[PDB]
Amino acid sequence: AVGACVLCNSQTSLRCGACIRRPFLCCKCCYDHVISTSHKLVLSVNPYVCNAPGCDVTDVTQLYLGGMSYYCKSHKPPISFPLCANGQVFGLYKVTDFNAIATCDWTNAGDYILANTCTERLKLFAAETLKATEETFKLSYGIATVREVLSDRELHLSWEVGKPRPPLNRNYVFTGYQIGEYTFEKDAVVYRGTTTYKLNVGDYFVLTSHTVMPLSAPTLVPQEHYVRITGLYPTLNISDEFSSNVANYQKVGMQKYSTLQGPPGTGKSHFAIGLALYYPSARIVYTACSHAAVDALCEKALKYLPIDKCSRIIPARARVECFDKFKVNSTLEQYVFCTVNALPETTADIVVFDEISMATNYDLSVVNARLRAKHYVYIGDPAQLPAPRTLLTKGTLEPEYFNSVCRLMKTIGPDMFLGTCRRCPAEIVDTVSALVYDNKLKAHKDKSAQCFKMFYKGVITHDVSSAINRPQIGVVREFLTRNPAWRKAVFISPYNSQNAVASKILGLPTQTVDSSQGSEYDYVIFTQTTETAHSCNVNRFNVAITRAKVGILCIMSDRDLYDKLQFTSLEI
Ligand SMILES: COC(=O)[C@@H]1C[C@@H](O)CN1C(=O)c1ccco1
Ligand SMILES: [Zn+2]
Ligand SMILES: [Zn+2]
C-alpha cells in the first residue's frame, strides 16, 4: 500500500477506493479529490472506515483518528482528530481535471478532450480508466446461443433476455465456447470462425473482456534534440528511389522522436522501409495497432529489405490470417514487424509506429513500456480515421484529440509532411486537399476523367442501427450496365448492412470506409447511404474517396460534400 501520487508524485499510503483504478493520492490531492466528488472511500493498509463494530460509516469526511484507529462522529473517543481537515487527509508522508477523469462515464467527447489536454500522468490515468470502463461495459451485453446451423457460413442465434445485444459487425469479436474467436454479419445471419469448427447447436459466444493492465511509460517520451545524427550510421550510397526522404531521415536521427503526416498515397510505407536502407546497421522495430497495417509494412519490406533479417511476430493466440513470408517469432532479427498488443520486451535503434491516427494513448504508452529505442518515428495522418471509441455516443471527437501524437500534429504541426499524392486522379487530390489539408496536398497524377458524383438521397432503411439505401444500390446497378469496365470496382459505404445488400445485388467486393483505410483499388463505388454525422465525417469522407487509383463513383446524400466533390456530375 506504499506508493506515489498520480498528481504530484508525493509518496503516500492513500489510494482512492471509489476510483475504478484505485490510484495513489497524497494527503493534499486526496482531500481535494474527496471534497469535490462523490468519491469518499480512502484506502491505506486498512481502509478508512469506522472501526466501531457494525458501523457502516466509510465516508472519509465523516471519520476521525482515535489513537491509532478510525471512528465516525458517533463513535470517536474524546481525543480524536478529523481525517479530513486543513486541506489534507491523514496518512503517511504528510486536480479539477483529475476529478473529471475519475468520475466521467466516457460517453461524451469532452471526456476524451480532457484525456488529451491534461498532464502526462493524467493521460495515463485517463487511458487505464477508459480502457477499464470499456471492458466492464462488455459484460453488460447478453449471451448469444446457437439455435440452428444452416450451412458452413450461415446460422440462427438466440439472445439473452434482459440484456442488450451488441452491434453485429467486425468491430465486435466474440469468444466462442474455448472453440476460437468468432465474428458476425447480417432471419439469415453469417458466422465467421477464426478456428474452423463444425458449428455446435447450444454452444454459446461471449465478448471476452481482457484485463486492463496499469500504465507506467508516458504516451510520448520527453523530446530531445541533437546537434548531429545520434546512434545511427547513415549510407553515402543511398538508392535514388529514397533520395527524396534523405533530409527527413537525417531529421529522424537528430531528434528522440519525430512525427510524419502522410496523406493518402504520399509514400508512408516507402518512407518507413527507406529509413532502413538509410541506416542500414540500425535494428528497426515496425509496429501498428492492426495486423493489416503491420502486414502492409511487411509487403513493402519484402520488396527492399533482406528477407533473412525480417521477422513477423505473431501472438500464440492467432486471431486472423496475417503475413506469411518472414521467419515467425524471431524477436532478435534486425527487422521486427509486430502489432502493439503482441510487442515483446526489447530495445531498438529506431522504432517506427505506423497508422498513428488509429492509436489510442493506451497503445502509445504500451509501446514506450515494451520498447526502449534511440529514435521513435510516428507515422500517419490526423485527417484519417481514429480508433473506434465504443463508449462515445455524445459529441464528435476532433483529430487533435485522437492521441498525443495527433494532438501535436494538429497544434505545433508535424515534423515532416509528405506533400505529393501519387495514387489518386487529380479530381480526388484536389477535393481532399481543400477539404482536410489546407490546400497543401498536391496531385501527381493527371485528372482521370473517371471521377463521378451523383446526388441521390434514395430511401434509408435500417438493420437495427446500421443503415441501408437500396435505391442508391439500384442507381449503381444501372451505372454498371452502362459502364461495364466498372465491374472491377470495390463497393464502399459507411455501413456494413449497406455493403451486405450491395454484395448480393451487385456482386462487387465490399468494404466499409473504416476497413478500407490503408488499401487502394483501381475503381471505387461509394454510396454515402445516409446524411448522419457518421456518413458526413470529413475524415471518413477523405479515406473513402482516396482509396481510388483510377476512377470513383460517389452516390451522395449530403449536399455539402456533394458540392465539394470536384468530379463530373451524372444525371438520373
Ligand atoms: C497534376 O495535375 C494535373 O495534371 C493538372 C490537372 C490536369 O487536368 C491538368 N493539370 C496541369 O497541371 C496542367 C497545367 C497546364 C495544363 O494542365
Ligand atoms: Zn498529490
Ligand atoms: Zn476517486
Ligand SMILES: [Zn+2]
Ligand atoms: Zn461509527
